[PDB]
Structures are given as C-alpha cells and as structure tokens.
C-alpha cells in the first residue's frame, strides 16, 4: 500500500497518464526484459528498448521467433521486428506489432549512454540486496 500522498491511486488519472504520456515517457513504459543470459551478465532485470536491439518473442502467436528490432513505433506502443510479418490479402507484406513486455532482449545495442545506463541500474539493484 502506498505512503506517498502525492502519487494517485485513481484508475482515471493513472490511465490518463499512460495514454497521454509524451515520447520521452513512452521510452520507459515500452520497456523490455533482459534475457536470462544477459540478466546474469549485467545484473539488471529490464531495460527500455532500442532501435538496433535483438529480441525474441515469448508470448504472442510468434512465440519463439527471434529477430532484430527495426522500428520502435512509440505512437502505437509497439515494435516491429525483422521478418515477424504476415501477408495482406493482396499479397503485400506488413510488419506485425509486438508489445515490448512480451519479448526478451537477447542482444544489446550498446553505446556510451547504454553502458552508463546499465551501470546506474546495476549499482542500484545491488545497493539494496547488499
């Protein structure tokens, strides 16, 4: 149960916050989980998903399909992954939509900012357990 009398526990406000969040806020909301191998290696559970990351679907009808992130299409709360597609009636091919909370990031697109971000998150999870 909440203690901070500045955070709202109302269904109406919490939904408004979610569905009217700006782009800089959807990056955190559309966050994915590290794989078992990476969670073991970086000591972080989950990260905000990036353009060139590699994922594996773990819940959809496409469960067990791996691929590369090709678009983090924040305006629809979705990511398209390479070759995760279906064909339209006319025969054209379209990329199907995946929510970041139903994939695991099997490989990281690491940068200077990502390395620092992994550090800060790793410094944290240890700072409570120890």
């Amino acid at each position: 149960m909440k203690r901070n009398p500045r955070v709202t526990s109302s269904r109406r406000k919490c939904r408004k916050a979610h569905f009217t969040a700006p782009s800089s806020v959807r990056r955190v909301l559309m966050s994915a989980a590290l794989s078992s191998e990476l969670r073991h290696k970086y000591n972080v559970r989950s990260i905000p998903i990036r353009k060139d990351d590699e994922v594996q679907v773990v819940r959809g009808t496409y469960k067990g399909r791996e691929g590369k992130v090709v678009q983090v299409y924040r305006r629809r709360w979705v990511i398209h992954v390479e070759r995760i597609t279906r064909e339209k009636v006319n025969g054209s091919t379209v990329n199907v939509g995946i929510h970041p909370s139903k994939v695991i990031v099997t490989k990281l697109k690491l940068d200077k900012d990502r390395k620092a971000l992994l550090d800060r998150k790793a410094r944290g999870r240890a700072a409570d357990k120890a």
């Binding site: 149960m1 526990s9 109302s10 269904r11």
Partner: protein, 252 residues
Amino acid sequence: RQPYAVSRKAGHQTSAESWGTGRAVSRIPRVGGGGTHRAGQGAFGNMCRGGRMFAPTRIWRKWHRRVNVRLRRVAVASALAATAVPAIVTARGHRIESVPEFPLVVSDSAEGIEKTAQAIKVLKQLGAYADAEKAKDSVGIRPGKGKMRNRRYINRKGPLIVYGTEGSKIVKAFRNLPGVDVANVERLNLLDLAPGGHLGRFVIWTESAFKKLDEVYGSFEASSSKKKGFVLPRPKMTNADLGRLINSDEVQ
C-alpha cells in the same frame, strides 16, 4: 463518508419559458429561439430530458451521525467478549480449527519480528495461517459499479493482531498480508472487532497487550478503567443457561 451532490445550477441554464395553452402542446416550459433542434424542447422539469432532478441532492445532508460516548464503549466491550468465544469466531467465518486456545495469546517475542516471511512463520506456529490463507485466496474483482469507483478488489477477513507496546515492528510485518489487520491495545476500533456488524473477529493477542486489557477497561467497580466515567456493563440475566434454571431442583 464524503458528501456527494449534483451541481446547484444543473438543469437551470436555459431561458426557457412556457408557451402557455392554446397551441395543442402541454404547458411545460420550452426552449425558445430557433435554428437548432433544441428550440421548442422541454426544460426545467424532472420529467424533461435535460431538466433538473426531483429534489436535487445537497451537501448539507446528514452524513455523519453521533453516538453517545458511553454507548460506543459498551459496544466495544460486547465485541471484545465475543472474540473470546470459539463458537462465535467460528460462525463469523474464521477457520479456527488448529488453534490451541481461546483467547489466543502469543508471547511477546512476536513483537520484535520484522518481515512478512517472519510473520508467516508466527501464523504457522499458531493455528492462524489457515485463516490468512482463506483471505488471500478469496481476493477477486468487485462485481458492479465499484470496480470503476476506485474499489476494485475485495477479500475476506483474516485475523486481527493486537499489540500492546507502542512503537513496535509487527505493524510492518503483517501489513502486506490481505485480510490481516494490526491494532494497538489502547485504541481498538469496533469496525475491526465486529466487521460488517457481525460479532466474532478472530484476534491474536500479544502477551504485552492481553495484560493491558484490565488496565484499559477495568472491572465492575467505579473508576477502575483507564477510561473516565465508565464501568463495564452488567447483564440482565446473571447466568444465561436456560438448561440449568429450567431443570434445577427449585423449579421442578
């Protein structure tokens, strides 16, 4: 409770006026003007669409009702007694079937516990964990309108833990457990001791708290309670056993 009421001005933001008689329509006030579907439509009536309600609710309803200070204390006394009767604690729905004794008093070593995991062992060593099981298992979404009025989940009641010493930590070991409530000994609440208005809340007393009860409520003697102007209520019937009275030698 918080008050609720309609807007004071609602249904009364039109310049509508009755056409009168002679036009083959009822005499309800109507919206004048023209150029829109609103023109000529009824207004201000509780039968009209867009009108104000009959007897609009006001915030100066009587939300809060007063009870005598003494009647509050009498009812708390009755609720406490019923917590000590196994048949009534059973009948009110608590699984009390492996508990050793009623009243259920546990040592003061419980006081210093810290974790929800620590609290779970204590309930297991009593016969208390089964009742806490039922509370957690019974959690579901509230049927009806309340699930969208910020009251989405409901559950059953578990046991109530009463501690005596102020400033303890079992407040924080038990709070994550659905159904389980913690109370301090001096300031007990009737809403916990008889929730739903039904007698028989399952109470786990700490030894620190069970010994303060005689301090708090006193006896059948004047000025013995910590409370002022209070004496425990006496019954209308000293022994309620109709078996013993009806089948005594004196009456037969």
